[PDB]
């Protein structure tokens, strides 16, 4: 089997997403390799897209997105710790 269209790093720490906006192929899976470097816990949460994975300090976790809809999601931590308010996912 096939493998994902994308895959993507994103660095989540205890001050921002790195990549904070994630820019992913509408209809295709995209791998995004979650990385908490951290102290805290976080959530990487794309509300629109039914995304909300939670990751400990120090974990990882590899998750699979497969978008249906063209558009700019806000991408956000609900537990409102990270410096900035600017998180986005873009579909197209």
Known sequence: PIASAKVIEVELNDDYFNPNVITIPI???????????GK???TFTIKKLGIDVVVESGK????????KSAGTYELICRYHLLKGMEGKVIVK
Do not use: R
């Open 40 to 42: 805290s816990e976080h």
């Open 27 to 37: 209809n295709e899976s995209t791998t995004l390799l979650l990385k908490n470097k």
């Open 60 to 67: 990882e976790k590899n998750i699979t997105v497969k978008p």
